[PDB]
Every structure is written in C-alpha cells, then in structure tokens.
C-alpha cells in the first residue's frame, strides 16, 4: 500500500469517471459490481474516500436515481465521516441525500442524518453557498408539520454569511423571511425576546411596512383583523420582496395554513391583554371584537384554558366571563401586608431626605 495504491486504484476510478459519461450502462454496472467487492478490503481506504463517494454517487446517476436507489446510499453515508478528517467535501456528500429523502417524503430519516452536521459547523468560512445549502434543506424539514419556531435561529442564519449582505433585492426577501416567523411562532418567552433580537436593527427598519408589523405586537390592543387586512393584506405583492409572500400565497394549502395561523395569532393577542386589563366582560362584547360567531368565540377559549395558558371562567347563561378571578382566601391579607412594606419603605425614603435639604439653605 506504501505510496503505490494512490496512483493505482484512484486511476481505476479515473477511468470510470471517463466511462460513466461515455460507455453504455451495461458493462459499467458490471464494472461497478466488480469494484464494490474490493471496497471493503483493499481500495480507496487510505484517506481519499471522497473519490469513492463520487463512484457510489455514480451508482445512483446511471438511472438518474429513483425512490429506492436514493435509499441505497445509506450503507456508506455515516461510515467515512470516521474515514478521514476533512471539513468540507465530507459534508457536501452527506447533506445531499436528505433532498432525496424529501423525494421519499421521509422526515424521520432526514433529521437523523441532519443530526450529524448541526455540530459539524465552522466550515462556512471557505464556502459562500454550501452552508447556504445546509439551511435551504433545513426549511422543509421544519416547514412541514408545525415547526414555526425551529425556523427562528434558522432565518437569522440566512441573514448571516456575508454573501447575503450585498444582494440588496435578494436581501429584501431575506427581510421577508426574518419577519414572517416571529409572528407565526406560538407564544413563548423565546418569542418574547425574539421581538427584541430582531428589533434594534438599523437596516431592518428600511421597509416602512415591516417596522410597523413588529410594532403592533410589542404594543397594545390590535385593530381587529379586518381593519388590519385592508392595510397590510395588499403589500404582499408590492416592493421587490414578493417570493416569501408568494410562498405564503402560492401553495394555497400553505396559504390556508398561513392565513388562519396569522388569524390565530391576532385572535389570541386580544385574549392575552383582555385577561391582563379587564376584570369582567360580557360574552357578546368579546365576540364582536373578534368579528365572528359567539359559538366560534367559545371554541377559542375552550382549547386555551385546557392549555391553561389563559385562565378564564366563562358562562353560557348570562354571558358573563371574567379574567383571573380565583377565590383568594389568603391573598387579601398577603397583598395587604405587601402594601405596608412598600409604604414603610416610602416613609423612610423622604425622612432622611428632608434633613439634608435644610442643610443647603440655612447652613452657616
């Protein structure tokens, strides 16, 4: 093997590189079935396995792949990650076949082989597009089921690598993708400062629309849904930013999932602060501030307090619902005793403050 296998067996697949474009598929799959036998014992196994990769890629490309031969790559994917320490070409091989798994429509296979590379970062410093390919395959694994918050750090990471900074109109649809998840994510403490992680940005606020969108959900009660859709359900075509908004519009089943979830976040944004600032409101009043049926209003508060994320005690005889109204057996005197210590700290605040104020008028 001593510096003589390198020019021997890689020259055998240097031939096969020339015949996979020239010779017909009949003798060369006899060439392959006669060359996969030697793969185990003596072949490319010194460290140069990333030429064995293009010939086990060449098994797929003779038929240009199908469903099953895409899954025939699985025997050699994870193996030569241990084969030779290398930062880029090994990753370029193993991030490929997950797009084939998407053509298999298999997500449980995809995230297991995605689990190998999320720790294998820090190779982006030489590649201006390959790290960008790792992200574009990792939308659809997260886009599909409900994961509107695993895409959070994802979409700031395609506000990352400095190719993106200098394609101003392709940079605009990066601003589309960096704003249409913070709303669409379910509520969390992570969303509650994600609105701050995207704010404080000098170049995000160039779009006059989207500075106001995150303004609405930092601030107070929202105009209902119909008085908002006439002011923001039209800019989704305009500008030079239509394609993630077309990604809202285009697949209408993706649209119906994104119409109603945008409806879901704004019908909820009432119910947070209506619990915060109201004590007791009628059933008829709240259903009018949601612009839908009173039965549909009761279905909204049913699956939120069985989530117990908003506590409520509704009624269906007098329509009298109320917010944050427990029995309070002990909290009367307990909150009263707190008001003493706030008061007694306050009478001590002015007491040592007056005596110095006399010392700057009548001192000597």
């Amino acid at each position: 093997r001593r510096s003589q296998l390198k020019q021997a067996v890689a020259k055998m697949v240097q031939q096969c590189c020339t015949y996979v474009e020239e010779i017909t598929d009949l003798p060369i799959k006899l060439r392959l079935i006669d060359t996969l036998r030697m793969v185990t014992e003596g072949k490319i196994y010194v460290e140069i396995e990333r030429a064995r990769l293009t010939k086990t890629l060449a098994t797929i490309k003779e038929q240009n792949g199908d469903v099953k031969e895409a899954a025939s790559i699985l025997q050699e994917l994870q193996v030569e990650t241990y084969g030779s320490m290398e930062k880029k070409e090994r990753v370029e091989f193993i991030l490929e076949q997950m797009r084939l798994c998407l053509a298999v429509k298999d997500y449980i296979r995809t995230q297991i082989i995605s689990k190998k590379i999320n720790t294998k970062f820090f190779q982006e410093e030489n590649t201006e597009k390959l790290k960008l390919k790792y992200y574009n395959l990792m939308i659809q694994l997260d886009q599909h089921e409900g994961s509107y918050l695993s895409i959070c750090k994802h979409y700031r990471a395609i506000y990352d690598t400095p190719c993106i900074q200098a394609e101003s109109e392709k940079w605009q649809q990066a601003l589309k993708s960096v704003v249409l998840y913070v709303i669409l994510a379910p509520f969390d403490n992570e969303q509650s400062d994600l609105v701050h992680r995207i704010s404080g940005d000098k170049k995000l606020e160039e779009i006059p629309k989207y500075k106001d969108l995150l303004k609405l959900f930092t601030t107070m009660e929202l105009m209902r849904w119909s008085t908002l859709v006439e002011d923001y359900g039209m800019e989704l075509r305009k500008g030079s930013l239509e394609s993630p908004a077309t990604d809202v519009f285009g697949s209408t089943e993706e649209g119906e999932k994104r119409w109603k979830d945008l409806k879901n976040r704004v019908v909820e944004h009432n119910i947070r602060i209506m619990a915060k600032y109201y004590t007791r409101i009628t059933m008829k009043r709240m259903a009018q501030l949601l612009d839908l049926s009173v039965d549909e209003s009761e279905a909204f508060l049913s699956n939120l307090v069985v989530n117990k994320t908003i506590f409520a005690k509704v009624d269906r005889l007098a329509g009298i619902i109320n917010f944050q109204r427990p029995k309070d057996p002990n909290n009367l005197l307990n909150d009263w005793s707190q008001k003493l210590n706030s008061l007694m700290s306050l009478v001590n605040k002015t007491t040592h403050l007056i005596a110095k104020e006399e010392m700057i008028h009548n001192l000597q």
Partner: protein, 159 residues
C-alpha cells in the same frame, strides 16, 4: 402469554398482567413473527387499560418495535391517539377504519365496553372544565349524545 390472558380475564392486577405479555413478547422476538406481532396488541391494550396513553407511542417509536411495523401497530397508535386527545368522536373514527383487526379479537370484544366507559367520562371532564354554571342542553350538543342518560351519568359523578 396465557399467564397474562387469564390474569387479565378477571381484571385484577393490570400491571403484573402487563409484565407477562412483556416477557411473552421478548421470548417471541426475532424467532416467531406471527406470534410477535399479536403480542404488541396485548401489551398496548393493557397500557390503554392502564390509562397511560402517551407511553404507547413511546414504545413503538423505540427501535425494538420500529422493526415490527404493520397494520395492527397502527391500529394501536390511533386508539391511543384517540384516548390522548380525550374525545368520544375521536374514538369512533378509529374503530371504523381499523375494524377488521381492532373489533375482531375475542378479548378486545370483551374489553372495549369497559374501555368506553373510562373514555366517556374523560371527554366529559374536558368539555365541562372551562366554565361555571352552564346548561345541560349544550353539553348534549357538544358531545352529540342524549340528555337523559347524560344527566344520569353526570349524577354518578357527584355521587
């Protein structure tokens, strides 16, 4: 297996009867595939009978049972999914779809009626939960069930 059959035929100690079908399946593993795939049914019916629905999906997602994919293990994920969301109508559609293997076995035909009563009250404390005083005419309208029997079944709860 039949140490667990007759001990579950009287419904005394489901936990120990669960332990028989576990060992009955570990013996059947990778040597008898007809008898192994029926053994998943008796452990997960007992686990629904144990009223731990999430642990059903926890087992079959484990790599030991990931080999034994089939129709009847999907017949148990859905019924567990029906009892997970704690609804009556969720349970009804799961029966009709997989009826040829769910409602075919001689002991399942004995255990569905007792499984129905637990799940009848389970949605019943779910929909009654979010409020105060309410009418009975809506809860009959939200379960799609009658009023007289529901009023008796509500009266058994306070007793």
């Amino acid at each position: 297996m039949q140490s667990g059959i007759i001990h579950a035929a009287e419904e005394k100690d489901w936990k120990t009867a669960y332990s028989y079908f576990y060992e009955a399946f570990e013996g059947y593993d990778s040597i008898d595939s007809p008898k192994a795939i029926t053994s998943l049914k008796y452990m997960l019916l007992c686990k629904i009978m144990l009223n731990t629905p999430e642990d059903v999906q926890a087992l079959v997602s484990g790599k030991l049972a990931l080999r034994y994919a089939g129709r009847q293990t999907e017949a148990l994920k859905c019924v567990a999914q029906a009892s997970k969301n704690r609804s009556l109508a969720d349970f009804e559609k799961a029966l009709t779809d997989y009826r040829a293997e769910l409602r075919d076995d001689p002991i399942i035909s004995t255990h569905l009626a007792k499984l129905y009563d637990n799940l009848l009250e389970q949605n019943l404390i779910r929909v009654i939960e979010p409020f105060s005083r309410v009418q009975i005419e809506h809860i009959s309208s939200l379960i799609k069930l009658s009023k007289a029997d529901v009023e008796r079944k509500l009266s058994q709860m306070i007793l």
